Each structure stands twice: as structure tokens, then as C-alpha cells.
Design a protein around this nucleic acid. Structure first.
Lengths: 392, 155
RNA sequence: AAGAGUUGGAUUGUUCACCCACCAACAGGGAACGUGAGCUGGGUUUAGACCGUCGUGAGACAGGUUGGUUUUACCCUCCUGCCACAGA
RNA sequence: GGAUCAACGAGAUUCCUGCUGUCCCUAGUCGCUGUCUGGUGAACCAACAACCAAGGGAACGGGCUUGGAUGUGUCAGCGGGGA
RNA sequence: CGGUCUCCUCGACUAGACGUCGCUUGUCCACGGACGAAAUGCAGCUAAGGGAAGUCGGCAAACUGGCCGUGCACCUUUGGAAG
RNA sequence: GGCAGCCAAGGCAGAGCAUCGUUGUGUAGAAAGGGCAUGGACAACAGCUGAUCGUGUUGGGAUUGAUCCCGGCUUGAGGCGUUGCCCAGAGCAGAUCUUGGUUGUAGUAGCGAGUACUCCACCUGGAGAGGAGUGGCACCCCGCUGUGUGCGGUUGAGGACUGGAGUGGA
RNA sequence: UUGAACAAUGGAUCCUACGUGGACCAUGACUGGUAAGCAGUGCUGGUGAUGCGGGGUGCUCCGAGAGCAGACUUACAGAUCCCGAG
RNA sequence: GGCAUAGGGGUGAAAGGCCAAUCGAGCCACCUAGUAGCUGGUUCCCUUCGAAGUUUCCCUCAGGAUAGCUGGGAUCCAAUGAUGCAA
RNA sequence: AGAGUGAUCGAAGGAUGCAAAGAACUCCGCGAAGAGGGUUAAAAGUCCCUGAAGCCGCAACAGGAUCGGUGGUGUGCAGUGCUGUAU
């Protein structure tokens, strides 16, 4: 017998195998179109969530009630150190898809990239790329290098640039690096390959890859929440208080026939730490490293030069000290989590999409508590001479 | 009588110990000895010290349904392991008696290894447990016989 | 053309019915009249009791009314996540 | 026994107020569980087994027939099935 | 964790043999330990805005709460109702 | 089925011997059709047995089958078997069968009301924890290394409960 | 011409111990009913009591009936492969 | 606390409640191995033969007796091939 | 014995050896045990004639996805017996 009153379905079955994903790094399963008519360029980067704040900006959207109005927007602060380029990979077009043809490496490879080949690094005899880096100087290894490059320039239909993210500059505990590969799109295959070779051991910055008002996709892993019940895992409505031996449950996990619970029935299990792609995220600002600017978070209105790290530092993170991005809204995963940022794929042509963004104010007040002050000097000037200051 | 289920080539190169009605859980002593089977005497004693100190575990291969998964069971390509304390102590006493027997036979016990350690279900001793609705059910202790032979190394 | 949707309430144990509205629309049905070791227990359907009619009576009543213990999963599978071995 | 009926009632029903997580629509927190664990340690149940679809059939199969799957073994759960 | 006869019965708050804490007396015994301790559960609490729209049904919880002063309606068997 | 051409065979007349012919399903049921097998009486085997009975267990052989015989081992007699016949408490897979012993479940569910323990010391075969931990060392000594939040009892030092309708005293 | 054919190990006379006495299926032979895998009947055969070949599977259809084997041949029905047979 | 009322009986401000976890007739031993047209079970092998669910009567319709079918024992008769030649 | 206030109900339970010769002494351990060493025809070891099935431990060997099963069939391959065997 039918259900008397209809309702939509609880949860997405596209994301069905809701399991703790295997890798803590976001996988790019699809890169943008090639379009050889364009100039060679990178299509992805690795940023790291450093926190979250809010900005002020005037809206440009004719026909809206907030048009030319100053809105307040929540942004994610994504600290992005320059990615070091170590190696190329070629991909040939086989009737089984793509087959990785050849992986060329750089000559002098950083030990933070060598760390990636060791679960324990301090007990190993750190021999990563030893014979490679010796034979590459060697003349007969120069052949196998110029021959691998020529192999890619002839058979590879896809060329990818292997780059490490330099997790160590974030001053989090980790000294290893996150190694990913990025499609060079645009240009011929030879042009792509020599563009990639130019950047061997180059430490390329994020503003070279992305613009400051452009839309990207945030691929990565979401926050883990552990084993969770149907009420929060799947969002089902919980039973009446009157129930016996449980409210926070699903009442009918199936009809008598079929005589098996189906994959479509909400069960409890792992919630969070799934691989998700949050698409169409506008970049609101690209700020330069704080070690070189010291005024990166200053805007048209500010009179004091300030850096995006708030008062008391980002909670559980620390200081931001590298080239940062202001993504609009929220990105997957916690802070300190590695987010791949790819060029958009589900491209629209709204003004919301093709809109220039200029930040008029960056809230750098204390997020540890309620910060009334945007600057330690502002805090001083308001709360003037105290006992500790007058004792100093 | 005194009959073990292990025929040695030269019992002049062996050391034997037996335990009867040991008042230890059988299903834990079985896993203990199955782990201890092929180890040398030094490896065995160090393993038992470490299991007591909980630094490494005893894999529950056969009698382990419901046992908790451990990171210390990777030593044996398993995941379920525990730390059976009373049985580790009883098997310690067993192997200590076998080592004393070796010393009596005039044999370096540090050269021997464990060949044929074994456990058997002994006679069960009944008690009464008291169930709801006026029922009575048994509590049977499930004890074990233990035996071990140490055979000197062959090089 | 079965992809998505098909609602909030009053009375009634109700399915149904009937109104009040909202809506793009408030379609019809199945799954042991899906679904009680999921719930509830309002109803039917025990033992108590009252009324009406019936019977001389005990008692009967698709006539009405009130009050009335819904137990067990740790087995196997399905499902949900989790993990190892892959040794045959 | 018919009809009023003050007071009383863990009686049955209806309305109003106040109050509220009963609900929209759930969230957080906490003790004891469970969860891991040392010692100890039952019982229920048990033809044998234990992945489905359709068919036929004591008309609603785990086994039969024709197909489709299926590496073996876990841990915590679970209430669709084992009429 | 059930039941089972009688006697004695301190100090403070308080109307108090209520309830809360303390001297005298007695006791730390109830299988424990780690891990902030999943889901679910049994218990204790909270919850914006709304306020029964939930449900057979305001079930469950909440509101109120002691004392003092002023004061109190219908109906009534003149007693009450009435805190 | 001797009164036979001779040997071989048969030679128990409801038997046996030779040739030929027919016919082979079966629930309930039946057979004055035929057998296997168990306990014991009466008889026979001048039956077997400490040069090892019976039981049991494992292999082998025979049989359409019920079942029979043998080898090995256990075991050791407080013995057993074959044939005829007689007397039967005389054959098990079931009966929610009776009694006994067990198995999985399963090292699982659990052992969660009554607020609560902690430190030092002593009592120990051991209890601030090792099986010959390890290198010198040739046991002493000197080094290094490991030890589970840790059994029980009782003083003392703390922290708490009972809180006189008591966990007190009769 | 022993006065029709064919068949026939048979006719007569008895005694006696049991099981059964729920049936069901198929067919213009039908009756009740709109009908029913409904209910009740008739002739015969089946199932029960019956396996085997075919109908994918199926107590009842089609063939055929069942001691143990060997060879040949067929019934029903089959031959794209599964699956013997173009 | 003592004592009194006992099973077709007690007692009950009545629920057929209560009378030793027992009550529309307590429990205990015996008659009793009650009876059951009803349910369940009914112990070795081979060979051969082999059904009925239909008739009549029955307080009969889940059962019986009675014919029928089914087995056995028979009696009187009937019927019942088979010489290689040579001697 | 045990159960019930009671009237009453009511079990399970045999076997060392010829002879206690009932296990001296040694090592280890707190000790029981255990390892030796003994009694004895034998441990037959106060659980004592024998010691089945079911179930379990261990070792060896053989396999291990599939009701693609147990079982049957006809071979095969390994391991393992038995019988006969010409010149």
C-alpha cells in the first residue's frame, strides 16, 4: 500500500558509498578541456585552509536590490605557498583511456619531496632519487632524460606537471610535502612540454595560476565526524518521544518484499571525511606573503597597515605567512587541510560568475572570543594605559 | 601414563613439562600457545614479558569471535588480539618448569626452541548462576591441561 | 514522457468522508490490504462495570459506554559503515 | 428508582488561560551503559544450511529449473528476511 | 535493589520526625581499569522564533509553589466554594 | 532323485541333478516363501582360551542384503564360540520419546541502583614487578635495556558517605 | 461342414487373515453457478501406489512402463550454442 | 502475638476474589497403567503376490459393521515338446 | 541425601592389585604439580577392570570462491594396502 502523504527522499544516492575516503588529499578526476588554441597554463593548485573571516565589498549586479550596496561576505582564508615543480608525466591515448607513458623528474629534488617515499624518514637511509640525480648528471642518464622528454613530445596526448605543495612553510607539525600533478592545458603538446620543462624546480606562485576575481572548484576531503546515526548522517526526522528503545532511528528499514534491506535505506555509519568537490567558488582576493608585504590585508578604507592574521592568530592554526587566497564562502574540510583548487568546470555566465570583486574591508579581529578591535594598536588606543603596559 | 603427543628423535635433546587442571580459561591458553609454538625459548619469554606489559598482543585466531581489533596484531597478519594475563602467567610457569627440566637434563635452555606446546580442555567444574523468572543456569570453569617440549637447536 | 514533485490543518480510532487554506499540483495505486523482536495501542477482541433491547434464568447482542500486562536478537543473511589476509 | 443537585473524585469527556522540544526541527551538554579491556562468564535457539530474479510447485523457496552475481575471514551496529 | 516485630534517638536552617548539611557511632562494600568516552540507549538538563500547528487524546515536561498584608466571584445543603 | 553304458558330479525326495520355457514396478496389506541377528534351557562340536577370552578400535576379504570371517593394536578372562532344537522382556533414526554425557552459540550477552576513592608503610614464595633481558665478565662487578595506572589485608595521612524514622545501640 | 470367427494352463468346489471404506485428475456426456485450481455427477484411463524419455521446471500431459549388464534399434520429441543429433 | 472458620467447604464493604508463587472448586496419596471412534511413534534382509476411497445399515458424516477389491491355504479334475548318426 | 508448613515426595551411587607392594630418593618450584627414579606381570595410582560413540587439542599430510554442495556415476591423479603371478 502506498504511503499516504508523499515526501522527497533523504540524502543523495550519487554520493552513495558514504565511507571514510582512502586518501587525505583531494583527487582531481577531471581536468578542464584542453583547447590547444589557448596558451599553455596550469589548471589547479594546492591551498591549505587557514581559517575563515568576513570581508566588506560593494555588489555589482544590475537588477538586484543590493546592487551598488556594500554587503558583508564570509570568506575562507586559504594559505597557498608556491608549489615546487618536480617532474613531468606524459599520457598516451589508448583505447582503454589514458596510459601514463613516461615520468621525467627534475635534477635536484627537495628532501621534503623525498619524504613522500618513506613512512618513516629518520630511520631510513634517505636514498630517494639518489641514483636518479647522479645518473642525470651522468651523460648516459642525460640520454634517458632527453629520450623520455622526446617520448612525451611525440606520443603523449596529455601532459601533466608534478608539483609539491610545501606543507612545511605553514609551520604545522608536518615536514613532508603534498605531491600532485596538474594538467598544462592549451598549446601544442611540444609547447606544453617545454612550458613544463621551463618550470623544473621553479617554485611557482598561486597568482600566476589564478586571477583575483575568478571562479574555481574546491576539491578535497570534508570534516570527519565519525560513526553517526540516521538523524544526522542522513537527516531523517526522529520518532515521537513515546517510542520504545529508541527515537533517533529509522522505523521501517524495508518492506517485507524484497526480503532484504536495500542500499537506498538510511543506515547509521561513517559521517564526514568524504571526498567532495565544492564548485563555483569565487576568488575575492589574492594577497602576497606577509613576510614581504606586512600590509597585505589593507584595503581602500584602512589607515593602518595590517596582515590577514587576526588578533591572537587563527584559532588552532597560527599566523598566515604565505600567499593567501580569499575564497568566497566555505570550502570542505577543517583548517590545516589540503584543498586542491581547480579551474571551474560547471561554468555559468551570470554576473555572479563573471563579476569583478574588490574587497573594501577585511575583518582581522580576534576569532578566539569576540574581538571588538581590528588592530592591536586600535586595542591600545581604546584600552590605553593598563597596569601591565605601565609596568613595561 | 606421562604420555605426550610428540615423538622426538632424541629425547636426550629435549625438555618436557606438563600441567593438569590448571584453572585457566582454555580458549585463551590455546591462542597463547599457538602463538608461542615455534618460537625459541628466549623469543618466547621475551614475547610473554611484552604481552604482559601490553606492548604486543596475542592474536585470537580461532577462539576470538567478538575480540577487539588491535594494531599489535599486525605482527601475525591478523587484527583481533588480546592480552590474556592469567594464561600468559600460567604458560610462563609451564615454560619455566620445562627450562628447569632442561637444566636438570644438562641442556642449554637458551639453545632450545619450543617444539610441541599444547593445551587440552580439562574437566569442567560447575557452579550455579541465577537467572530471571526463577531459573538456574551453570557456570562451568573450562580449565586446561598444558604440555610443552623444548627441543635443542639443530645447526 | 513515470525524472522531480504531490502540502499545512479542524472533526473522527478511523481507511474513507467533509470542510478551512496554501500551491505549479495538492493524481490514483502496490510492496504478506509493505512496515508492532520499528513505535503507538485510539480501535476491534478476554477477565471488571453501566445502560438499552432480548431471555423465567444464567446470560446474548455488526446496539451504545468506560477501564484494561503488546515479551526476546548476542545466531545467519541483507543493509550500514570497518578491517585484514589473499594464503586455497 | 425518575429529575434537579452543594461538596468531594488518581472517574469519562469539552473549552479558555498560562506554560512549555509535543511539534516546525532539531541541536548541545552531562552521569551510567555500550564502545576497548584484566578477571569471570551463561542462556535462547539449532534438520542441514545461510547471495538474488523469475518460473513451476501444497498456489509467498536457502536448496528445485533457467538465469544473474559471488575471494576467504572480521568489528560495531541493524531490525527487511529466516512465513 | 523484594519482604520481615518492637524500643532509644544529637546540632544548624526550618512549622517540622519534611528536606539539606554536620559532632557521636559505623562504613568506603557493592567486579574493576584505560580511552573524553562512536552510534543507540536509560537518566539529568537546557534551547532562539512560534506556542498543541504534534498526538486517539496537552501523553510527557514545563508554568505555579513557603510566609506576610490587602482581598476574593458564580453557585450553595448556608457548612462551603476558598489557598 | 541307482532298478543307470563307464568315470566326474549329484546323492537332505518341498532337497539335489540336467535341459528347456515364462515372468521381473509397487503404497496399504500378505506369504503354511527363504534367510541374517540377540538372551538363555536341553543336546552335539573329546570346539576355542594365560602360546591371551570377550569388549573395543583400525585395515582386509566375503555377501544382493540382513550380516559373516580374518590381520594389527587395546585388553587380559570375575572367559568365549559353531550346529540342532526349545523358551523369549529378542533388531530403532524419529515417538515436543526416557536416562546420561556433550556441542555450536561463545570467550559472546553480560557481571552498570545504594556518590569514592587516593598516598606512604608493613604483612609476601613473588607484588616498586624480567627467566637464565643484554654487552663487557669470567659468579662478583661495571654498563645498557624492559616493567601492565598494578592481587589481598591492615596501621597511619587525606577525601567522602551513613546523618538519630541511621549503615548506630538492644 | 465336428455345421461362425478369435483367443484361452483352464473349469468346478470351498475355506480363510488382513488393508481399504477422506479420494483426486483428464475429456461437447453433463447439472448448479457470471465464473472458479468452485460444487456434484457419467464412461474410461490415470494419479494415489509410478520410477524412466520429452514438455526448462511441474504427483495427473505426450511416449513408455521399471531385476543386473552388453550390443543394436527406436517411441514421444528433437538438432544455432547451452545440449546428443543438419 | 494468641485462637477460631477447611474444600462443593471456608471467607469475602462481592473482584467467582481469597484459602502457602495453586482456585468458576486448594493440595496430597490411592482407585489409575481411568477412558479416548483422536494426535504421535511402532526396531532386520531378500523374494513373490498386491489394493480401496465404492454398496447397505448405524445418534451414522474423523468411526464402525456389511458386500466389493487385496493375500494365503487348499479340494475335484484337466493341461503339460525335445533319440546326430552307427550298433 | 534432598524437597514441601504439612499430608507426603524421594534420588544418584558396584569392580586397584595376587599381594598396599598405595609411589622411597633426586631436580625445580611457595606449593600443587612436572621431569627423573621406583613398586608391579602391568600402573591397574585410592578419579583406580575395560574404556565406545559424540566433542575437543596437537602433529603430519590433502585440499579449500560458487547447492558448481552431501550422495551417486564413469575415468583420472596422488597416497595406501590386498590377491595372483609364465619362462
Amino acid at each position: 500500500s502506498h504511503r499516504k502523504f508523499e515526501r522527497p527522499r533523504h540524502g543523495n544516492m550519487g554520493f552513495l558509498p558514504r565511507k571514510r575516503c582512502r586518501r587525505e588529499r583531494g583527487r582531481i578526476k577531471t581536468f578542464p578541456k584542453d583547447d590547444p588554441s589557448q596558451a599553455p597554463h596550469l589548471t589547479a593548485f594546492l591551498c591549505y585552509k587557514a581559517g575563515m573571516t568576513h570581508v566588506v565589498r560593494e555588489l555589482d549586479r544590475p537588477g538586484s536590490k543590493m546592487h551598488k550596496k556594500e554587503v558583508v561576505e564570509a570568506v575562507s582564508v586559504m594559505e597557498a605557498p608556491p608549489m615546487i615543480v618536480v617532474g613531468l608525466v606524459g599520457y598516451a591515448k589508448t583505447p582503454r583511456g589514458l596510459r601514463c607513458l613516461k615520468t621525467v623528474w627534475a635534477q635536484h629534488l627537495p628532501e621534503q619531496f623525498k619524504r613522500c617515499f618513506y613512512k618513516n624518514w629518520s630511520r631510513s637511509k634517505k636514498k630517494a632519487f639518489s641514483h636518479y640525480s647522479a645518473n642525470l648528471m651522468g651523460p648516459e642518464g642525460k640520454k634517458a632524460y632527453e629520450a623520455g622528454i622526446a617520448k612525451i613530445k611525440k606520443f603523449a596526448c596529455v601532459v601533466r606537471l608534478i608539483a609539491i605543495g610545501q606543507v612545511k612553510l605553514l609551520r604545522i607539525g608536518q615536514k613532508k610535502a603534498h605531491c600532485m600533478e596538474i594538467q598544462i592545458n592549451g598549446g601544442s603538446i611540444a609547447d606544453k612540454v617545454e612550458f613544463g620543462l621551463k618550470l623544473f624546480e621553479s617554485s611557482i606562485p598561486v597568482d600566476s595560476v589564478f586571477k583575483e576575481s575568478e571562479v574555481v572548484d574546491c576539491i578535497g576531503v570534508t570534516r570527519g565526524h565519525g560513526f553517526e546515526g540516521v538523524i544526522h548522517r542522513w537527516g531523517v526526522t526522529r520518532l515521537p518521544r513515546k517510542t520504545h528503545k529508541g527515537l533517533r532511528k529509522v522505523a521501517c528499514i524495508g518492506a517485507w518484499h524484497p526480503a532484504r534491506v536495500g542500499y537506498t535505506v538510511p543506515r547509521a555509519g561513517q559521517n564526514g571525511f568524504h571526498h567532495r568537490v565544492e564548485a563555483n567558488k569565487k576568488i575575492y582576493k589574492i594577497g602576497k606573503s606577509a613576510l614581504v608585504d606586512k600590509a597585505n590585508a589593507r584595503c581602500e578604507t584602512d589607515l593602518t597597515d595590517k596582515t590577514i592574521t587576526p588578533l591572537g592568530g587563527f584559532v588552532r592554526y597560527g599566523i598566515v605567512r604565505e600567499d593567501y587566497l580569499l575564497i568566497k564562502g566555505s570550502v570542505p574540510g577543517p583548517i590545516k587541510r589540503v584543498m586542491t583548487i581547480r579551474k571551474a568546470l560547471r561554468i555559468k555566465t551570470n554576473k555572479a560568475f563573471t563579476e569583478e570583486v574588490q574587497v573594501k574591508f577585511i575583518d582581522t579581529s580576534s576569532k578566539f572570543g569576540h574581538g571588538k578591535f581590528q588592530t592591536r594598536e586600535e586595542k591600545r588606543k581604546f584600552m590605553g594605559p593598563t597596569k601591565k603596559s605601565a609596568l613595561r | 601414563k606421562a604420555k605426550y603427543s610428540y615423538t622426538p628423535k632424541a629425547e636426550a635433546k629435549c625438555a618436557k613439562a606438563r600441567g593438569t587442571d590448571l584453572r585457566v580459561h582454555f580458549k585463551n591458553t590455546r591462542e597463547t600457545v599457538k602463538t608461542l609454538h615455534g618460537m625459541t625459548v628466549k623469543k618466547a619469554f621475551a614475547y610473554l614479558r611484552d604481552v604482559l606489559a601490553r606492548k604486543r598482543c596475542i592474536p585470537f585466531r580461532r577462539y576470538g569471535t567478538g575480540c577487539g581489533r588491535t594494531p599489535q596484531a599486525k605482527e601475525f597478519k591478523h587484527t583481533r588480539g588480546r592480552w590474556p594475563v592469567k594464561s600468559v602467567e600460567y604458560v610462563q610457569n609451564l615454560l619455566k618448569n620445562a627450562v628447569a627440566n632442561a637444566n636438570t637434563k644438562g641442556l642449554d635452555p637458551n639453545a632450545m626452541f619450543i617444539s610441541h606446546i599444547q593445551a587440552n580442555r580439562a574437566q569442567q567444574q560447575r557452579r550455579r548462576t541465577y537467572r530471571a523468572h526463577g531459573r538456574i543456569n551453570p557456570y562451568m570453569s573450562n580449565p586446561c591441561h598444558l604440555e610443552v617440549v623444548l627441543v635443542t637447536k639443530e645447526e
